[model samples]
Target chain A: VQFKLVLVGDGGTGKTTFVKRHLTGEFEKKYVATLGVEVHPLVFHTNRGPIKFNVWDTAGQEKFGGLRDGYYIQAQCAIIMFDVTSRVTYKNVPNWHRDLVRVCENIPIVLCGNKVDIKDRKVKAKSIVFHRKKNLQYYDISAKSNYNFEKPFLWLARKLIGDPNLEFVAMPALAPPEVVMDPALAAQYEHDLEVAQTTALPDEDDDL
Target chain B: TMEEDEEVLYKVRAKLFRFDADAKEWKERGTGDCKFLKNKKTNKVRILMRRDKTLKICANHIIAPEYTLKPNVGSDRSWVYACTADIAEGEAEAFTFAIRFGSKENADKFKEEFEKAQEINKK
Candidate 1:
């Protein structure tokens, strides 16, 4: 069975870093804000069968609210993430939850407390405590350290696939087809792709 | 006891839009439509149009002691309710009505009040 997971959080909460770590096994410092939605597919080979996760990462700003609902149509699960240092982003989790419930109700949702490695945390322990009180399954993880990343992903995967011993299977069959492109299209594509890859690092001046 | 009578006042609709960073402008991103009713007599608001079949608040306005304290109140829905109570006693007339989204009644009222205030200021 295939599972479609979505990662949503406020901007600069290390969503791209988390996805890139899961994809490339390498951690990068910088990230750009996701414009709309970007799909990345990862295959997991479980004891029962191969499970492919088509993960979609979306932008977290209010302006992106329009694009947010489109990603929810076929989503089987959602990971609502927030930076540990940004209280504002943490506070917006319910709004995100409300959006998901409005679009796709009764889907499995896992709330993530991201950026735990930050020395100075803006979100207090009481905030997470409040989340627990609200009966949300919560995980405090740092995408940079890859700390606690496997737990939530595996939990959701096991819930969806019903098997735990699933080794990740790399799909070599589906590869990108190369097409000759004009210089402008190619340049624009490359520029946008590069920007998408590097826009997640927190801005120095912004508190979040 | 008298029978409860509810009357529909006005209907409203709003679409959610996204801001474009590249062009530094606003653009139509996605569409979320809501309908609400306002009763001027009782000052009651009810959401009538929703796709979810659930009545939920669409928007709110807040008044607080300070901006820092505003976060404390705004973050919690219950706190907003408490703040509304404070407004009731201190500025009863200012507390017009509360609803999810800004319906036509509230929008028209706002415009009329704003124009009147402007005229008063000019005089």
Candidate 2:
């Protein structure tokens, strides 16, 4: 299934870095300002099925029109990120959260504290209380080290799909197994089919 | 992206329904041209269907030897079958699909072609 995943944070909060990390699992050393917002398609092969999330990474600066409400429209889920190394970045977490909810209400939103690989990180896990207060899922992520990078996305996927036990698995060349149905079980199924024939089918039209 | 070369063996206008296990009811997937497409390279046939307007693929999977088409409970124009369809959402999900054609004659034609593909794959 396809879902729009809105990603927002401060200019230097490492949102792009975190997103690009999914591509090759390698960190990008350079930092370039996102034009406005970049839409990246992330496909995950799971046991349940393949899920595609269009991750919308909003520009941190307003000069590129990233702060506009149109980007948040039709968003199924969101990620509000903050830099763990910058105290000022963490302070703007509430504004981003508030702005997101204004456009997309009650969607599954995740709070990510990025750049946790730094030894002198300014934001500590204990100091992050906005997520708990807002009842949003929280994760500590390091794009460079790739630590907990998928936790935020996984949590949002579970919430959006409404399947708590969703898991990602490899999709290799499928082998169609050859098997035969049991004769007794097949007979039982035939009887069950008779019972189903008695019941009237539901209304076919969904629209009034 | 690699393009798949598929040859259509059977195509018919039909509406597809999947049994929602959680809801315990039949859910309409979409209405479009249901096709049995055979891969030119692999010589394997599979069922592929898409929605009419959006053109979104709703059903895609190979016709295996284990797959069987059973008559839908009281309906002569509808048939129910279970298989693993690699479609929009779940690539590895076992879905029970109920497909309805415009007439019983069309339904019977589809079954004959479907069983023919099954026998070919069994080889």
Candidate 3:
């Protein structure tokens, strides 16, 4: 099974840093802003089968606004983030959520409150109360500390695959056989295969 | 008498000369430093001759490399021209003139003008 996830947020909210921590298990102090979208794939082995996850991390700045929305085309889940230390960023979460819902309808979403390690959190208790009122599931996390990181992914995986009993396998490490296609046969048989599949009668003949 | 001649001064502006990538020839847009002054704005004229290679007049105070001053000349021939005021003041300014086989003549002309400009200013 394969799942495609997306992280969307404003610039400086630490979306890329979160994804990097998830993949490498190392935290870097320096923040280099992302320009466009970056894709990372992680594979987990589960009892059901090997599940592959493609995570798309997007730039949060206005300069990348044109190219940002295009990344949500086929996203199965989204994590919208805001810096807990910045009130304006937390306030903008609804806009980010709206954008996701507009593109990827009904896709599961996780709201992430990042930079919890900052001493003075600008997002007040009332704002988090509002988020809860809106029935938005959120996690207060520190990408720098790797706090509550895996919980969100676990929740998303349960929602996507539907069976907790299934073991999760990391997909990138697995080697699969490559298919070699003969150009002439591939071109000739393409239309025939499409037509054969499309014209095939449904198992219920009575309805037709 | 020498001090009198050193005080004679005039202000000039920097001009963008043509850049030749091949064979590397820099054709001055105008003749002499005085002719270069007419094209630039008033403030640029005031500081043109005062500028060193490291001193950039742009908005950001970005220091231009020596090669950018006369880009048409090949990289080896590129050099900065010291401003007349600093030269007259005997303040050390770094630069070498690049004229084929006649660098001494170029230096003599620069020194003479520099002294003449200062001399006029003193009077």
Candidate that scores best on lDDT? 2
User: What is the alpha-carbon interface RMSD for each candidate?
Assistant: 25.0, 10.5, 35.8
The best-first sequence of candidates by lDDT reads: 2, 3, 1
| lDDT, model 1, position B52 | 18
lDDT score at residue A163, model 3, on the 0-100 scale: 70
In model 1, the runs with Cα more than 4 Å from the true position are A64-66, A130-135, A163-208, B1-123
Against the reference, the lDDT scores of all candidates come to 0.50, 0.73, 0.51
Off by over 4 Å in 3: A129-135, A164-208, B1-123
Q: Residue B43's C-alpha lDDT in candidate 3?
A: 18
The numbered model that scores best in TM-score is 2
lDDT of 3: 0.51
How would you order the candidates by DockQ, starting with the best? 2, 1, 3
- Score candidate 2 by TM-score against the native: 0.52
DockQ of every candidate structure: 0.01, 0.05, 0.00
For every model shown, the clashing-pair count is: 10, 2, 28
- Mind giving the per-residue lDDT tens digits that candidate 2 earns over A1-208? 9999999988888988888766423245568888789999987666677788899999887687555667899999999999999998889999988889999888999999998888998987789999877889988888765577778877877887889998665343332333345566666655444433333234433110
Give the per-residue lDDT digits (tens) of candidate 1, residues A79-157: 8898989998888888788877788776667788888877998887775754564455688888765568766666677
- How do all models score by TM-score? 0.48, 0.52, 0.48
Model 3, span A41-100: residue lDDT tens: 965445566567798888889887557678899899888889989888878888887878
